[PDB]
Assembly symmetry: D3
């Protein structure tokens, strides 16, 4: 149907889970979904539709960078009628409020992209999640004894940043971690009146140079895929 | 003590409700607080300290526009150790999703001001409110039966806009109404590690040209006043 | 009548003195004008009409920052048919060419605001006063024995600057002091074919830190008030 | 070895062909290289190494958008010692100077991204390819008798444009087509002193609205795969 | 001595007249000066020193555009000790307040150049003349029977504008004409603590499309030449 | 005919050499062409027509800076039907890849000017020459035994930079030298669908502070003149 998804009109559940990594897309389908079927794979970017504890969920990969995410989020919304889009991934912590393992809920995604200025009269679009997915996230985490942590992220166009001198100022302004797609997600979902949210797990801490060795990696991660699949039940 | 605030240290409770109009601050103090006491009056910009149901609460006017708001919040936080800033005021609605009498919770404050680009590396700061404050508002609105509309707001440098043709584009991106201070409030609280939220009563709707009577005003502004006093007592 | 002025049409004389502080306006009306009457008091922003040397003068407060100033002078010109606007105020000197108690005539008002790019094609609007008003100021000052310092000011959206390191560069480019409204006053009167001028009294020096005593401030501001009333009569 | 490439230092040859679609990297590998070996598959993005008419060629996919391309090009150059990067892809045409089937060499890559302004002092970086690569591309296509259309492309952050009205002005200034990567490839190559060039095949024509049929995509594509492989040998 | 001026040190008087056109400079020197001496001729950009009513006056051409003017003005001040610079030239009127043969005094010089954002912190530099030179111009015009038309000019990088639809807005904001150097002359004189002014002869009206004959051009410019030489003697 | 060229219709051959310095133009005319005739001299900006190997070639001065170059180039193309414009000039090297006497071929002109943002949607116009001309230049340089340096230049609005600290970043991004017209030439040629190239002779090195003698300057320029005349033959 779409230039980047050849799934079938209705193959998606109205509530989709999102990663940049199509590998962890399937990792969630395998380890977490019953009735798991692969619905899309153009450019090897994969999505799945299954059921989590009797309730049907879709999964979908969005690649890396705001433009990439914008392409897939736009198509999930305008063609496949997706309505709620949760995004989950890792991030680089920059705030002394976050330690590794932590899960961040992004109540706002700042950015160095020009996309929002192109979208929004060259003014300052404050790209924000949808509210009633956010309180769902805080209630389900307290429900779970997860100390969900809430603040802004900075969505950058640069994985290898040319402005590492500025992280302290970003963290000063309640940016807990840096990721690369939430601003495009939040903005696209704003443009199209859909509901979106983004969570991230602190894998690396860019200030304390600390990191998670591959052990607790796909164990810290999993502790928030259920977070997401829970919230979404 | 500061060039813009007249009060001794300790005169301000760590919780403070904010309005642009200092005569609404004065109206709130007399009609809703016990033992109210005018603690500042520089440039006729009034502030009060009193109690609402046993709980100590402060009130402060902040003038019109981001620059004015910013001066007053900076001095509240850094001299008078105010920790929670809740702003209530009116707004011109631009979104079909709301109408007169509605109370908006601003989960993002977009802007045409340059101040956040000055603050934040010439990038896009998503100015946002403190999440736990945004939670107590949702909880208190529900307890009180208020249908709280939740979305973004646009803080303009212009009361008389030169971009009225753009109100639709803003409404499309889930900007419910226009005011002039939220983005500066949210950015100053982010800079100084304090908690802030902005609530807005729809007094006029700039697209539907509907206004309301100069007495349903004080009554629906009253609603918001009780909602705010309640969520911090 | 307007949302921010509740004076009747015709209550304002065609020449108007402005200050940021309404208690300053009130001070001028009681001490220096004859037969002054309060004509507006919305949001505690007082305005007055009275007589000086047989001639009708109006006073009006405009609050703090470009956005607030812009509201009041837009309304004064467009609704109350004010033709000439003289703003007096204090300022923080940044240049070695001025000292305490100097009066600066602002023949250019630079800014970190975005309002003039929004107004003016996103180009650089050189915000300037009316030349005939500035000529009348220089002639009245000469008659009074006042050595007027003439140069640019910098109108900032920030009272508490994040760019203090730049004050020397501003001084280099003939910015004698910093204040927060001139560029908006000048742009609005340009927009609306009205005549405006800004005079600033040097009460503090931001570089050398010298300040005026409380008595010296009153005396200094009085010398500027006499200058202003004399050049409007 | 890197966060996004799984190969080891040694597995990439100095000369690498680039595509956005990793399935297209495999098509080329299976049909054109002997000894084809898959060397990386992080996030399911596939790189290959093999031989073409005796000489060793490498292949790597880079995803969609300037940000995603930059992550991979940076890693290929800095970690895997790639030195020539030839990019081949599709493009939507916007100019009357090109029809379908045609191959465009991008002697420059304009863009609506802010990445080059972040990289290059908020000025205008003219992102261009290495001249030696483009000289071979023209000589090789001349030997194969392929009519090479040479001019600028426009690299955008947007697959689904918000500025369709602008395509005519882009084509007037000698932009033959729009894609989403060339500017980031050229600017990363410039940054890290590597040689880069972008060729792209006209699969769509956004103005005349006519596209290539299913069989016709891979047809004209091949003719350009050979041009690329021929010029690396 | 400088790369663009080969006059001996001391060849320039401290007061210098400027035109874009070196042949206009040549014309002034032959027709109006006593003992005119050509002192520099690099790139055919002529300059002269001579006498007017027994007082030394220098002349210098500066070519077309902010960048050309900035070069010559920078060298005249820093190397040749020029202290006052008076620019006289033609312009394309855009305001209904001026007609053919008017002389405009530019109390401000707006621009579509980025030069002042580069000079001045990416903020808005309000480029203005020296007030005393303005005053001396006004008093000399009055003495000679010349009614100066006083307001802003817009200094553009473009002779052949791509924004002719904006002229009405420029005129609305008190821009009386368009030329191509004043903003550079003023910013450079401000940078270097020198005294500068720009005077413009209305030879063409861009709105009405009326234009002076070749004779009427000579006669009109001569009257402005006498204004200039008189205000310097 | 135009306000800046007084050549009669058809005086210009469709191939034209361009220099900033009109006396450099006059020099080429007497030393390097046969039957040379001066065809324009407005504002002392000389232009010539003549023959090299019996083929007609025209020569035109274009002053200093983008705004000035843009004027003469627009009129050459639009009014005099010039189809091929070749700019030869000097520049100041900033890269260790080049030294004195080297001839640079600008395949890209970055800039700090705002002209291209004004022309091109406020985006990044990557300003480039006509490939065919650049190829012809490379073939002729090899045919002449000339070691052509190839890369970008940076076209500044400033001869006296305020950003000398940033010359290594530019050199890092393969800007070999700094001049002041190339991006204006390239953009105007793109605008009006004509063919242009820029060649520089390195006369000063802004890093190492090397510079050429008065003599070494004309001997190396004569090399560049021969290259230019040969590739038009």
């Amino acid at each position: 149907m779409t230039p980047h998804i050849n799934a079938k009109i209705g193959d998606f559940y109205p509530q989709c889970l999102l990663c940049g990594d199509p590998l962890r897309v399937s990792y969630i389908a395998k380890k977490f979904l019953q009735d798991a079927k692969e619905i899309t794979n153009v450019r090897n970017m994969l999505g799945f539709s299954g059921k989590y504890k009797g309730r049907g969920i879709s999964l979908m990969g969005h690649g890396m960078g705001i433009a990439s995410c914008t392409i897939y989020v736009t198509e999930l919304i305008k063609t496949y009628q997706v309505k709620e889009l949760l995004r989950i991934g890792t991030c680089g912590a920059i705030s002394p409020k976050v330690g590794l393992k932590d899960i961040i809920m992004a109540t706002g995604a700042s950015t160095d992209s020009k996309t929002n200025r192109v979208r929004f009269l060259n003014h300052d679009l404050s790209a924000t999640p949808d509210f009633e997915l956010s309180l769902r996230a805080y209630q389900t985490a307290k429900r779970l004894g997860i100390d969900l942590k809430v603040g802004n992220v900075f969505s950058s166009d640069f994985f290898y940043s040319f402005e590492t001198h500025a992280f302290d100022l970003m963290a000063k302004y309640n940016h807990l971690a840096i990721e690369m797609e939430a601003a495009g997600l939040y903005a696209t979902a704003m443009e199209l009146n859909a509901k979106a949210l983004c969570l991230c797990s602190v894998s690396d801490h860019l200030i304390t140079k600390e990191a998670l060795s591959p052990k607790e990696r796909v164990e810290s991660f999993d502790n928030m895929i259920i977070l997401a699949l829970e919230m979404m039940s």
